[PDB]
Design an enzyme around this catalytic site. Structure first.
Site, short mmCIF file in Angstrom:
data_model
loop_
_atom_site.label_atom_id
_atom_site.label_comp_id
_atom_site.label_asym_id
_atom_site.label_seq_id
_atom_site.Cartn_x
_atom_site.Cartn_y
_atom_site.Cartn_z
CG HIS D 61 25.61 0.49 11.36
ND1 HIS D 61 26.85 -0.15 11.35
CD2 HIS D 61 24.89 -0.13 12.32
CE1 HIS D 61 26.84 -1.10 12.27
NE2 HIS D 61 25.64 -1.10 12.91
CG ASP D 91 32.92 -22.61 -11.91
OD1 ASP D 91 32.00 -21.80 -11.64
OD2 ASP D 91 34.12 -22.30 -11.82
CD1 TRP D 126 17.10 -2.04 9.83
CD2 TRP D 126 17.19 -3.32 8.00
NE1 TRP D 126 16.70 -3.30 10.18
CE2 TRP D 126 16.76 -4.11 9.08
CE3 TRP D 126 17.32 -3.91 6.74
CZ2 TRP D 126 16.45 -5.45 8.95
CZ3 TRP D 126 17.06 -5.26 6.63
CH2 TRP D 126 16.62 -6.01 7.71
CB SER D 156 23.16 -9.37 -6.57
OG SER D 156 24.28 -10.11 -6.16
CB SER D 157 20.56 -12.08 -3.11
OG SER D 157 21.67 -11.55 -2.40
CG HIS D 240 11.82 -13.84 10.98
ND1 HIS D 240 12.35 -13.40 12.21
CD2 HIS D 240 12.32 -15.07 10.79
CE1 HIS D 240 13.03 -14.35 12.74
NE2 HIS D 240 13.09 -15.37 11.86
CD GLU D 242 18.65 -10.60 4.55
OE1 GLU D 242 19.86 -10.21 4.63
OE2 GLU D 242 18.17 -11.23 3.56
CE1 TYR D 244 15.81 -17.74 12.82
CE2 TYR D 244 14.18 -16.33 11.79
CZ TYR D 244 14.68 -16.93 12.93
OH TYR D 244 14.07 -16.68 14.14
CB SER D 255 28.29 -27.71 11.32
OG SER D 255 27.08 -27.49 12.03
CG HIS D 290 8.60 -11.86 15.68
ND1 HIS D 290 8.88 -13.21 15.57
CD2 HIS D 290 9.62 -11.18 15.07
CE1 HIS D 290 10.03 -13.34 14.92
NE2 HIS D 290 10.47 -12.14 14.55
CG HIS D 291 10.07 -8.00 13.01
ND1 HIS D 291 11.31 -7.67 13.55
CD2 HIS D 291 10.19 -9.27 12.52
CE1 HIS D 291 12.11 -8.74 13.41
NE2 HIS D 291 11.44 -9.71 12.80
CB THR D 316 17.57 -22.69 17.44
OG1 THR D 316 16.73 -22.15 16.40
CG2 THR D 316 18.89 -21.98 17.41
CE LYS D 319 22.30 -25.85 12.62
NZ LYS D 319 22.55 -27.21 12.09
NE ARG D 438 15.86 -0.32 16.71
CZ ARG D 438 15.69 -1.34 15.88
NH1 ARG D 438 14.84 -2.30 16.18
NH2 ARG D 438 16.40 -1.42 14.78
C1 HEA Z 1 21.18 -13.56 12.98
C2 HEA Z 1 20.10 -12.82 12.94
C3 HEA Z 1 18.97 -13.14 13.81
C4 HEA Z 1 18.59 -14.36 14.38
C5 HEA Z 1 19.06 -15.73 14.11
C6 HEA Z 1 17.42 -13.98 15.22
C7 HEA Z 1 16.77 -14.99 15.99
C8 HEA Z 1 15.59 -14.76 16.78
N1 HEA Z 1 15.01 -13.52 16.96
FE1 HEA Z 1 15.65 -11.74 16.36
N2 HEA Z 1 16.14 -10.08 15.33
C9 HEA Z 1 17.17 -9.79 14.51
C10 HEA Z 1 18.11 -10.78 14.08
C11 HEA Z 1 18.03 -12.16 14.43
N3 HEA Z 1 17.13 -12.69 15.29
C12 HEA Z 1 17.20 -8.43 13.99
C13 HEA Z 1 18.13 -7.78 13.05
C14 HEA Z 1 16.08 -7.80 14.65
C15 HEA Z 1 15.69 -6.33 14.54
C16 HEA Z 1 15.16 -5.84 13.29
C17 HEA Z 1 15.01 -4.36 13.43
O1 HEA Z 1 14.00 -3.98 14.04
O2 HEA Z 1 15.88 -3.59 12.90
C18 HEA Z 1 15.51 -8.91 15.39
C19 HEA Z 1 14.35 -8.67 16.14
C20 HEA Z 1 13.54 -9.68 16.74
C21 HEA Z 1 12.15 -9.40 17.28
C22 HEA Z 1 11.35 -8.12 17.19
C23 HEA Z 1 11.57 -7.35 18.51
C24 HEA Z 1 11.01 -5.93 18.41
O3 HEA Z 1 11.37 -5.19 17.47
O4 HEA Z 1 10.26 -5.50 19.35
C25 HEA Z 1 11.78 -10.65 17.87
C26 HEA Z 1 10.38 -10.94 18.37
O5 HEA Z 1 10.06 -12.07 18.73
C27 HEA Z 1 12.89 -11.58 17.62
C28 HEA Z 1 12.93 -12.96 18.14
C29 HEA Z 1 13.98 -13.84 17.73
C30 HEA Z 1 13.82 -15.23 18.09
C31 HEA Z 1 12.81 -15.86 18.98
C32 HEA Z 1 14.92 -15.86 17.44
C33 HEA Z 1 15.21 -17.32 17.48
O6 HEA Z 1 15.49 -17.78 16.14
C34 HEA Z 1 16.33 -17.65 18.49
C35 HEA Z 1 16.50 -19.14 18.83
C36 HEA Z 1 17.72 -19.44 19.66
C37 HEA Z 1 17.76 -19.78 20.94
C38 HEA Z 1 16.54 -19.85 21.82
C39 HEA Z 1 19.10 -20.05 21.64
C40 HEA Z 1 19.56 -21.49 21.41
C41 HEA Z 1 18.59 -22.50 22.01
C42 HEA Z 1 18.79 -23.34 23.04
C43 HEA Z 1 20.11 -23.39 23.82
C44 HEA Z 1 17.67 -24.30 23.44
C45 HEA Z 1 16.87 -24.09 24.68
C46 HEA Z 1 16.18 -22.75 24.69
C47 HEA Z 1 14.97 -22.52 25.19
C48 HEA Z 1 14.09 -23.56 25.76
C49 HEA Z 1 14.40 -21.13 25.14
N4 HEA Z 1 14.02 -10.94 17.11
C1 HEA Z 2 25.42 -7.73 10.42
C2 HEA Z 2 24.80 -6.75 10.97
C3 HEA Z 2 25.46 -5.83 11.92
C4 HEA Z 2 26.81 -5.70 12.40
C5 HEA Z 2 27.97 -6.57 12.14
C6 HEA Z 2 26.73 -4.52 13.25
C7 HEA Z 2 27.86 -4.03 13.94
C8 HEA Z 2 27.86 -2.94 14.85
N1 HEA Z 2 26.76 -2.22 15.20
FE1 HEA Z 2 24.94 -2.28 14.41
N2 HEA Z 2 23.11 -2.34 13.54
C9 HEA Z 2 22.66 -3.27 12.70
C10 HEA Z 2 23.42 -4.37 12.24
C11 HEA Z 2 24.78 -4.66 12.48
N3 HEA Z 2 25.51 -3.90 13.31
C12 HEA Z 2 21.30 -3.03 12.31
C13 HEA Z 2 20.43 -3.87 11.41
C14 HEA Z 2 20.87 -1.88 13.00
C15 HEA Z 2 19.53 -1.19 13.08
C16 HEA Z 2 19.49 0.02 12.11
C17 HEA Z 2 18.14 0.77 12.27
O1 HEA Z 2 17.70 1.01 13.40
O2 HEA Z 2 17.47 1.02 11.23
C18 HEA Z 2 22.07 -1.58 13.79
C19 HEA Z 2 22.08 -0.50 14.66
C20 HEA Z 2 23.12 -0.22 15.58
C21 HEA Z 2 22.95 0.69 16.72
C22 HEA Z 2 21.69 1.38 17.16
C23 HEA Z 2 21.58 2.78 16.53
C24 HEA Z 2 20.32 3.51 17.04
O3 HEA Z 2 19.32 2.78 17.44
O4 HEA Z 2 20.27 4.76 17.02
C25 HEA Z 2 24.24 0.68 17.37
C26 HEA Z 2 24.54 1.41 18.62
O5 HEA Z 2 25.55 1.23 19.28
C27 HEA Z 2 25.09 -0.18 16.54
C28 HEA Z 2 26.48 -0.46 16.83
C29 HEA Z 2 27.23 -1.41 16.14
C30 HEA Z 2 28.64 -1.52 16.43
C31 HEA Z 2 29.35 -0.71 17.46
C32 HEA Z 2 29.07 -2.55 15.58
C33 HEA Z 2 30.41 -3.16 15.38
O6 HEA Z 2 31.37 -2.05 15.51
C34 HEA Z 2 30.60 -4.31 16.35
C35 HEA Z 2 31.97 -5.00 15.90
C36 HEA Z 2 31.96 -5.68 14.52
C37 HEA Z 2 32.79 -5.35 13.51
C38 HEA Z 2 33.73 -4.27 13.74
C39 HEA Z 2 32.71 -6.03 12.17
C40 HEA Z 2 33.90 -6.70 11.75
C41 HEA Z 2 33.85 -7.38 10.39
C42 HEA Z 2 34.58 -7.03 9.34
C43 HEA Z 2 35.47 -5.82 9.31
C44 HEA Z 2 34.55 -7.91 8.11
C45 HEA Z 2 35.85 -8.63 7.89
C46 HEA Z 2 35.83 -9.43 6.59
C47 HEA Z 2 36.53 -10.58 6.36
C48 HEA Z 2 37.31 -11.22 7.42
C49 HEA Z 2 36.33 -11.29 5.03
N4 HEA Z 2 24.41 -0.69 15.42
CU LIG Z 3 11.80 -11.65 13.00
#
Ligand code: HEA
Ligand code: HEA
Ligand SMILES: [Cu+2]
Ligand SMILES: CCCCCCCCCCCCCCCCCC(=O)OC[C@H](COP(=O)([O-])OCC(O)COP(=O)([O-])OC[C@@H](COC(=O)CCCCCCCCCCCCCCCCC)OC(=O)CCCCCCCCCCCCCCCCC)OC(=O)CCCCCCCCCCCCCCCCC
Ligand SMILES: CCCCCCCCCCCCCCCCCC(=O)OC[C@H](COP(=O)([O-])OCC(O)COP(=O)([O-])OC[C@@H](COC(=O)CCCCCCCCCCCCCCCCC)OC(=O)CCCCCCCCCCCCCCCCC)OC(=O)CCCCCCCCCCCCCCCCC
Ligand SMILES: CCCCC/C=C/C/C=C/C/C=C/C/C=C\CCCC(=O)O[C@H](COC(=O)CCCCCCCCCCCCCCCCC)COP(=O)(O)OCCN
Ligand SMILES: CCCCC/C=C\C/C=C/C/C=C\C/C=C\CCCC(=O)O[C@H](COC(=O)CCCCCCCCCCCCCCCCC)COP(=O)(O)OCCN
Ligand SMILES: CCCCCC/C=C/CCCCCCCCCC(=O)O[C@H](COC(=O)CCCCCCCCCCCCCCC)COP(=O)(O)OC[C@@H](O)CO
Ligand SMILES: CCCCCC/C=C\CCCCCCCCCC(=O)O[C@H](COC(=O)CCCCCCCCCCCCCCC)COP(=O)(O)OC[C@@H](O)CO
Ligand SMILES: CCCCCCCCCCO[C@@H]1O[C@H](CO)[C@@H](O[C@H]2O[C@H](CO)[C@@H](O)[C@H](O)[C@H]2O)[C@H](O)[C@H]1O
Ligand SMILES: CCCCCCCCCCO[C@@H]1O[C@H](CO)[C@@H](O[C@H]2O[C@H](CO)[C@@H](O)[C@H](O)[C@H]2O)[C@H](O)[C@H]1O
Ligand SMILES: C[C@H](CCC(=O)O)[C@H]1CC[C@H]2[C@@H]3[C@H](O)C[C@@H]4C[C@H](O)CC[C@]4(C)[C@H]3C[C@H](O)[C@]12C
Ligand code: CUA
Ligand SMILES: [Mg+2]
Ligand code: NA
Lengths: 72, 227, 75, 513, 258, 56, 44, 75, 72
Positions: D61, D91, D126, D156-157, D240, D242, D244, D255, D290-291, D316, D319, D438
């Protein structure tokens, strides 16, 4: 210029390689192999290698590379 | 343990979990306020026929937008780090217990004085005694003295596991070849539950942790009986 | 003696080296005391500390390797 | 002619179209996997009767949604379509290498689907942490096929990042400085820099895992003096950045969308938006551990990673407030794309804030490896990425196709998706706080009510996905050809018509100093 | 067109390259698990055929057709620098693994580095010679560069021949080293870090040497002008990268790690 | 050797509508057909191998 | 190459019903695939 | 015992660390043996080696500093 | 250009200085001085200093710098 880099090539760089070649060749004699000890952090075998009998490393040298059971 | 329809943390069993509850209450108030402000401002921007589409100067407002968030983050980090350094502070433990993770059960070693060790397996649903909890009970609980500082050492004999007890504020990864330390102190007697918290294969969901906290006199009687 | 006290040499969550160092210290002291036919009671502090901290399987594996001649630490 | 055009492409638009089709298909796979997850959890007990298969489904997934849906759509699709148009370039710099970045993805996906079909699959997460991902606990080909899938995706990337950085630096009009390029173009350049630096480190780490599995190396095996925690550092050093990478192109599209539907010529605080994206990109490389707050690192290390992670909130927030200030004073057009963008701003904010909660190592002890983390990233990543994608898709569909969507249908689609994702993920916060781990196939009985509701939410989002396919069909079926769009003076990608000719900017733009 | 950029003819090589990647990876899987080299040898063959025809076409487009305007050359410069940066980061991962293992040696090693039972190579013997060889080749390639800029065909060919000869000497010395080494890739994390880091470096020396050999034959066929020779510049940059990675390996793994 | 670049320039600039990968003549066609046949045949073989490996 | 709406795509939109069949096969095949892979693993 | 044998830890012309290490080892062993009221005879090898190698004035200065509480080595 | 280096000055360099100023500020305040031990390798006096009473270092701080005979 090209003349300066040729001068460095023949006057410094290749002489350096000649001196390191002489140094290496003077120290090229075979060393006496150490007693075999079947240490568990060495001769690792978690999966057979995909060649030979599965138990020989890719550039295995019978003289200096013991197997898990010792020198061949 | 958790109860049905629970919204927040399990009730704190240790002083450090109490601290975490207070710290979460503080932080959640900020999260709510910022979330609410952003939603409110969206609604404010979208609800007027008045317009201003010419270039706007950004300098003055960006000072507010950086300084105010910086202050808020400092106000979160100060108490956050105070608790971090409390949970590291030199304690004199009176007891050390080891736990080893396995696929899929925990073993426990009490080797301060006697070589006591045992395995701790989930009770299958088909074997639960009436009123016992599905996926949470074990055959051999971790008997420990209450109101005492305990050193837990955590490792694994195979893959990664993670030894957790939410109501005590505990989660320590179990890594083969590594001995991770945490401190445990329960304010109360009782049974305290947790679950393996690093994916370790097909039975990750099924290797729980059960602490049994009893007065020192009963802990000593239990230790003496084990000879 | 209740349990192993805080050791400022090993103040962090990773206690691997604390177990290893006390195991080495016990066996170095035991060898020193046996070789002059001296008294292993002198080694008792290290024995209690490593027994408290070290996983049984680590102790058992290290003991086996010492008997095999494959223990990689210096005793 | 069909093979020359679609297999042998050197055209940025056709390659962008291939990426959008690929990504949409991948999204169906990812969605199906997500519904299987939530079906297993939708009542207490076992559905599949095989927890190894559950773990394979969770693993697949994530890989499908990240590597085959989000990155191909945002970077390969919108990036290839829009970046050359937005800078008046004929291009990409390397138009033939661009085609290989695309054609590496079907083989990459085939390797992932081979991993799941051989032996018992890669039930690893993953993250693919050893020793679970090693040759004892996951003997056989599945994990090696997963590693190879990631190598091809990574090549690719990396080649795509080289192409985008070169294009953006080298192929603007000679008068156009970097500070006269649109924010979407900035967002792709920054994303590409993160890919170029992060993916090689992942490649090193998974290569080490490959050699530990097959060549008797012990990088991660304590028996040889290795360390499973080294793998985690190498993985998260990539992972991390990734996260962003997954959001930055989304920030760029948001924007453009907010500016366009506010009736503005420009986003509020352009240089602040550039500053914020570059700041996020830079800080994104210094926060990875932090992971790893529960693995046993030193207290001072935890203190540093807490503090560094919290800093990301400042750029952030600039923005988020800048998007609000772009709405301010707008003649607001309540288009479906605007609805997606407003949903993004709010849902991204919620997820970012739960990220700040998690940044606190102390509290992370209790929240790590719980549904709190799952809730955090499904808000910020899953909803954030998907809402930015759907906003960009409904905004630019007329440019790419030459046809209009039915706006009322598109608004219905938005409304259904908004309900479904919030019903699915909001209750996962309660499950996390109350201690549900989880990566579980089943849960203690206390957790039943919020799992039941979450699984019901997942079906609402499925209804939205099915409706989206119908909406695209209806646009191609009806053939309403675009004539005009407003604000072309500040949206160059529209000025060659809909769709633009195969070759655009044969005669470049005139821009004087 | 009235821009200076290159609209590339529709090409099959992206697809053949992508399929070669599938065959090499599925091939390695079938070698490691299903005791068969067939798919792997097809993949390696198609990969070499793809790289041959793709870079042949770039030569046709530039030397023969005139498509490399200054703007196009500028883009290729950026592309090669960015590619080298990605390769630096790939090596960084292997250095991180080396320093992680060697700075905190675990009890299984004897809690020391080098581990108990490891007899490192003397860094003053063949490793030092290899160092002198690659440093010398950095001087000779610079002579080649200046000869070409000054319009001197004979001295460019002599300098480039010497550079290639030194690369080949390094490769044969390293092959000899590998065979004589009393430790193997299976000798714990010492052998793992040694052979994987030096082995990826040796692969990059073979790649770089091959690139210099292509430049040698293009020079023999008068492809390069005194002003326009990006293939030579890119091969020199890549060669300097290979040198610098060696110096970091030498100091880190052979010297400090001994 | 003699400088024959002008003769290659004339060949590769001939107005014959051929794409650059075929513009050298019949040998280009042979090498393309060998490459594409090995790639497509190899890919079909990889799918067969997948089918075999998907079952005990 | 053909230019303009419906001509810059690798699929035909000449007939909306043939298009519906192609879109059905395309998105349906992707959505179905994980269900059939789960079935394949269970039948082992 | 005639004199201190060759020690592979100290193979070079500068023998300072050899003297220092055996002086430390003697005093560490003596402290370990006196604290339990065990036997200092087990420490005798280190005593003979440091007495053979170490200049009288170095030993004398180190002894004075141990008595003063200013010895900078760990015993 | 100048614009890019000003952007780096105000957007990266000065913010770094502000963060490190914050970090230093928070960890300021006097730590408890260690027991005086008259170690012979410290408080070296082979010749009187050419200022004051000959026995005080140039930037002597009475709180943390003991004399050869101990804290003042
Ligand atoms: C789009 C993807 C994306 C983005 C942008 C972020 C953004 C952030 N993530 Fe998250 N993160 C994930 C995707 C993302 N994360 C994924 C996939 C995991 C799990 C990986 C896994 O284990 O599978 C994860 C897990 C993850 C962890 C590990 C948790 C754990 O496993 O125990 C932590 C720890 O600090 C973290 C922190 C943050 C923080 C601080 C930001 C910051 O960048 C957020 C900043 C934004 C805001 C704060 C809101 C806007 C701000 C304002 C309105 C201003 C005023 C706000 C304040 C004064 C607070 N995230
Ligand atoms: C981009 C990242 C992304 C997206 C979109 C999603 C989408 C969803 N995910 Fe998640 N998910 C992850 C990233 C994502 N996930 C990751 C990283 C993990 C952790 C894996 C691990 O633990 O190792 C996770 C794990 C995770 C869990 C935890 C499993 C566990 O801990 O045992 C659950 C549980 O409910 C869940 C649910 C969902 C559901 C219900 C949706 C969706 O059904 C929500 C609705 C969104 C859609 C249906 C997508 C629609 C978009 C399209 C169809 C594209 C269209 C294209 C064009 C228009 C060009 N996902
Ligand atoms: Cu991180
Ligand atoms: C649209 C699509 C559909 C939506 C999906 C439906 C979800 C299910 C609804 C939840 C209802 C819960 C319920 O039964 O409420 C009873 C509950 C009864 O109160 P209580 O039992 O006395 O609880 C007091 C606890 O001590 C209070 O202390 P506690 O520790 O027990 O509770 C802490 C906990 C519980 O917090 C709450 O009380 C609820 C959260 C607010 C919901 C909005 O809050 C959390 O930490 C949740 C994490 C949230 C992350 C940030 C979310 C940002 C919000 C966006 C703001 C927008 C404003 C509009 O009432 C509520 O609090 C309402 C919720
Ligand atoms: C795990 C693996 C990963 C797979 C992932 C798959 C997803 C990636 C998709 C990427 C797209 C690939 C396109 C490459 C070329 C397609 C070749 C082909 O088979 O052509 C037939 C087919 C079009 O049929 P048509 O309408 O008769 O058009 C023919 C020409 O007009 C008239 O030209 P003609 O007469 O000269 O030649 C047409 C003729 C024959 O012409 C030829 O000579 C072509 C022969 C070589 C083509 C080989 C293509 C290889 C594709 C690999 C996948 C990538 O074609 C046919 O009618 C028969 C061929 C049928 C083959 C089936 C290919 C289906 C695609 C893959 C689906 C996934 C199946 C996997 C199963 C999974 C089970 C676990 O092309 C497609 O596959 C197009 C996609 C299908 C329709 C989707 C509509 C969705 C719209 C949503 C919009 C969202 C994006 C917004 C776009 C923005 C607007 C600008
Ligand atoms: C002479 C200088 C250089 C020589 C080059 C090496 C020759 C053979 C292979 C070439 C490829 C090299 C790359 C590095 C990969 C791994 C191992 C190579 C290092 C090497 O050659 O090490 C040898 C072992 O090789 C082994 O296991 C066997 C190795 C063969 C199989 C390797 C398969 C693994 C491929 C990994 C693919 C990763 C690709 C990454 C792509 C990333 C894109 C994002 C050492 O011999 P030994 O007998 O143990 O000890 C010597 C004792 N006398
Ligand atoms: C903010 C820092 C900037 C430095 C300015 C401060 C002092 C004067 C000038 C410094 C010049 C640099 C180095 C000279 C040598 C010593 C000074 C070192 C720096 C210093 O200032 O050291 C101080 C001692 O100064 C002392 O002895 C004082 C010594 C004063 C006399 C110096 C003697 C001059 C030496 C001759 C110079 C020769 C130059 C040769 C040139 C080469 C020609 C070929 C430290 O104070 P303290 O109380 O011991 O400890 C702190 C306790 N709380
Ligand atoms: C036995 C062998 C086993 C090993 C096999 C593995 C592969 C080895 C391959 C070695 C690389 C050969 C590259 C040859 C490139 C030839 C084309 C070329 O050099 O093309 C030049 C352009 O450069 C360009 O595209 C620059 C092109 C840059 C190419 C970069 C190549 C480095 C590739 C590394 C491969 C990946 C390795 C990663 C593994 C972890 C053409 O421009 P000019 O030179 O200005 O000419 C024009 C003038 O004549 C006008 O007057
Ligand atoms: C287990 C094994 C898995 C590995 C599978 C390997 C993956 C794929 C198979 C690779 C097949 C390679 C075939 C040759 C590719 C040549 C690309 C190239 O040379 O691309 C050039 C651009 O990149 C430039 O310069 C600079 C970029 C040149 C890069 C060359 C190829 C690199 C391939 C591997 C790289 C991995 C990087 C290592 C770091 C992690 C030319 O761009 P074009 O658009 O063509 O033309 C533009 C025209 O104007 C030229 O006249
Ligand atoms: C976060 C929500 C909204 C924040 C909005 C902040 C926007 C600030 C607008 C500043 O623009 C100015 O407005 C003034 C007219 O009033 C003008 O006189 C001035 O020239 C202009 O620059
Ligand atoms: C031009 C396009 C390319 C077309 C593809 C060509 C396909 C060639 C089919 C041959 O298949 C082979 O059959 C061998 C014999 O059946 C196998 O031998 C291997 O399998 C044997 C099974 O008996 C084992 O003994 C050994 O591992 C080994 O000899 C080998 O794996 C396999 O590849
Ligand atoms: C005679 C011939 C002239 C080439 C020409 O201008 O066409 C010379 C010029 C430089 C020569 C090369 C260089 O002198 C360097 C090499 C010297 C070796 O002794 C033979 C091979 C070697 C690689 C030479 C081959 C050949 O003899 C070359 C190519
Ligand atoms: Cu043990 Cu999860
Ligand atoms: Mg974890
Ligand atoms: Na279930």
């Amino acid at each position: 210029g090209a003349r300066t880099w040729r001068f460095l090539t023949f006057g410094l760089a290749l002489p350096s390689v000649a001196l390191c070649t002489l140094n290496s060749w003077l120290h090229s004699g075979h060393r006496e192999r150490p007693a075999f000890i079947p240490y568990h952090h060495l001769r690792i075998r978690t999966k057979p290698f995909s060649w030979g009998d599965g138990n020989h490393t890719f550039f295995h040298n019978p003289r200096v590379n013991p197997l898990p059971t010792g020198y061949e | 343990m958790a109860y049905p329809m629970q919204l927040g943390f399990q009730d704190a069993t240790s002083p450090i979990m109490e601290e975490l509850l207070h710290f979460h209450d503080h932080t959640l108030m900020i999260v709510f306020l910022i979330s609410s402000l952003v939603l409110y401002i969206i609604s404010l921007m979208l609800t007027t026929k008045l317009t201003h589409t010419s270039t706007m100067d950004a300098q003055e407002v960006e000072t507010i937008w950086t300084i105010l968030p910086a202050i808020i983050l400092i106000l979160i980090a100060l108490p956050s780090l105070r608790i971090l350094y409390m949970m590291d502070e030199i304690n004199n433990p009176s007891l050390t217990v080891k736990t080893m993770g396995h696929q899929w059960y925990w073993s426990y070693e009490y080797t301060d004085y006697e070589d006591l060790s045992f395995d701790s397996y989930m009770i299958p649903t088909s074997e639960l005694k009436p009123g016992e909890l599905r996926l949470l009970e074990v055959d051999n609980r971790v008997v420990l003295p209450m109101e005492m500082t305990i050193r837990m050492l955590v490792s694994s004999e195979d893959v990664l596991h993670s030894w957790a007890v939410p109501s005590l504020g505990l989660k320590t990864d179990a890594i083969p070849g590594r001995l991770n330390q945490t401190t445990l102190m329960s304010s109360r007697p009782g049974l305290y539950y947790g679950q393996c918290s690093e994916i370790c294969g097909s039975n990750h969901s099924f290797m729980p942790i059960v602490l049994e906290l009893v007065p020192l006199k009963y802990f000593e009687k239990w230790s003496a009986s084990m000879l | 003696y209740q349990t192993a006290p805080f050791d400022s040499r090993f103040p962090n969550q990773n206690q691997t080296r604390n177990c290893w160092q006390n195991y080495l210290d016990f066996h170095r002291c035991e060898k020193a005391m046996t070789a002059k036919g001296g008294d292993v009671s002198v080694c008792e502090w290290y024995r209690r500390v490593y027994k408290s901290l070290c996983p049984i399987s680590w102790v058992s594996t290290w003991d086996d390797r010492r008997a095999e001649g494959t223990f990689p630490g210096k005793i | 002619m069909f093979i020359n055009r679609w297999l042998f492409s050197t055209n940025h638009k056709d390659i962008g179209t291939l990426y959008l089709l690929f990504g949409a298909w991948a999204g169906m796979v990812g969605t199906a996997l997500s519904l299987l997850i939530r079906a297993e959890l939708g009542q207490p007990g076992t559905l599949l009767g095989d927890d190894q298969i559950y773990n394979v489904v969770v693993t697949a997934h994530a890989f499908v949604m990240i590597f085959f849906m989000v990155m191909p759509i945002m970077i390969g699709g919108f990036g290839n379509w829009l970046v050359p148009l937005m800078i008046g370039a004929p291009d990409m710099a390397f138009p033939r290498m661009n085609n290989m970045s695309f054609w590496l993805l079907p083989p990459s996906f085939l390797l992932l689907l081979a991993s799941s079909m051989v032996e018992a699959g890669a039930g690893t997460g993953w993250t693919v942490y050893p020793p679970l991902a090693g040759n004892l606990a996951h003997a056989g080909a599945s994990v090696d096929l997963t590693i190879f899938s990631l190598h091809l995706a990574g090549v690719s990337s990396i080649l795509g990042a080289i192409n985008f950085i070169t294009t953006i630096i080298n192929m603007k009009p000679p008068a156009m400085s970097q500070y006269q390029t649109p924010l979407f173009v900035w967002s792709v350049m920054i994303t590409a820099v993160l890919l170029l630096l992060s993916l090689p480190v992942l490649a090193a780490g998974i290569t080490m895992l490959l050699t530990d599995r097959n060549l008797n190396t012990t990088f991660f095996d304590p028996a040889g003096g290795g360390d499973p925690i080294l793998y985690q550092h190498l993985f998260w050093f990539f992972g991390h950045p990734e996260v962003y990478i997954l959001i930055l192109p989304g920030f760029g599209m948001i924007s453009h969308i907010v500016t366009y539907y506010s009736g503005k010529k420009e986003p509020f605080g352009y240089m602040g938006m550039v500053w914020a994206m570059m700041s996020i990109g830079f800080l994104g490389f210094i926060v990875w551990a932090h992971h790893m707050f529960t693995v046993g690192m030193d207290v001072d290390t935890r203190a540093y990673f807490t503090s560094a992670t919290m800093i990301i909130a400042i750029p952030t927030g600039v923005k988020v407030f800048s998007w609000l200030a772009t709405l301010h004073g707008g003649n607001i057009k309540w288009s479906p794309a605007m609805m997606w963008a407003l949903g993004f701003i709010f849902l991204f904010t919620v997820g970012g804030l739960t990220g700040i909660v998690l940044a606190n190592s102390s509290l992370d002890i209790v929240l790590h490896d719980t549904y709190y983390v799952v809730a955090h990233f499904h808000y910020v990543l899953s909803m954030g990425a998907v809402f930015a994608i759907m906003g960009g898709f409904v905004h630019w569909f007329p440019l790419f196709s030459g046809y209009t969507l039915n706006d009322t249908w598109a608004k219905i689609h938005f409304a259904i998706m908004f309900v479904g994702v919030n019903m699915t993920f909001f209750p996962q916060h309660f499950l996390g706080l109350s201690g549900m781990p989880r990566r579980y196939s089943d849960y203690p009985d206390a957790y039943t009510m919020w799992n039941t509701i979450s699984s019901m939410g997942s079906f609402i989002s499925l209804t939205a996905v099915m409706l989206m396919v119908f909406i695209i069909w209806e646009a191609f079926a009806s053939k309403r050809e675009v004539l005009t769009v407003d604000l072309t003076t500040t949206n160059l990608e529209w000025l060659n018509g809909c769709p633009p000719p195969y070759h655009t900017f044969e005669e470049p733009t005139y821009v004087n100093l | 067109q009235t821009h200076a950029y290159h609209m590339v003819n529709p090409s099959p090589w992206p697809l053949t390259g992508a399929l070669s990647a599938l065959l090499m990876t599925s091939g390695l899987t079938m070698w490691f698990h299903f005791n068969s080299m067939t798919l792997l040898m097809i993949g390696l063959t198609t990969n070499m055929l793809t790289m041959y025809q793709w870079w042949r076409d770039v030569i046709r487009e530039s030397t023969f057709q005139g498509h490399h305007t200054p703007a196009v050359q500028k883009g290729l410069r950026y592309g090669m620098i960015l590619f080298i940066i990605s390769e630096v980061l790939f090596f960084t991962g292997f250095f991180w693994a080396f320093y992680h293992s060697s700075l905190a040696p675990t009890p299984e090693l004897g809690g020391c580095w080098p581990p108990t039972g490891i007899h490192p190579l003397n860094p003053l013997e063949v490793p030092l010679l290899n160092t002198s060889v690659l440093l010398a080749s950095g001087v000779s390639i610079t002579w080649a560069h200046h000869s070409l800029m000054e319009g001197d065909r004979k001295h460019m060919l002599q300098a480039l021949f010497i550079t290639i000869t030194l690369g080949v000497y390094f490769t044969l010395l390293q092959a000899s080293e590998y065979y004589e080494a009393p430790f193997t890739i299976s000798d714990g994390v010492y052998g793992s870090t040694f052979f994987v880091a030096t082995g990826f470096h040796g692969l990059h020396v073979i790649i770089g040497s091959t690139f210099l050999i292509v430049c040698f034959f293009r020079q023999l066929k008068f492809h390069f002008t005194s002003n326009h020779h990006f293939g030579f510049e890119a091969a020199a940059w890549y060669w300097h990268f290979v040198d610098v990675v060696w110096l970091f390996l030498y100091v880190s793994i052979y010297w400090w790690g001994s | 050797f003699e400088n024959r670049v002008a003769e290659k320039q004339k060949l590769f600039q001939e107005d014959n509508g051929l794409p650059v990968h075929l513009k050298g003549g019949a040998t280009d066609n042979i090498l393309y057909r060998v490459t594409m046949t090995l790639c497509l045949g190899g890919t079909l073989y990889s799918l067969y191998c997948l089918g075999w490996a998907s079952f005990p | 190459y053909e230019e303009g709406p419906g001509k810059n795509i690798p699929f035909s939109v000449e007939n909306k019903w043939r298009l519906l069949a192609m879109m059905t096969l395309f998105f349906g095949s992707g959505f179905a695939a994980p269900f059939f892979i789960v079935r394949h693993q269970l039948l082992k």
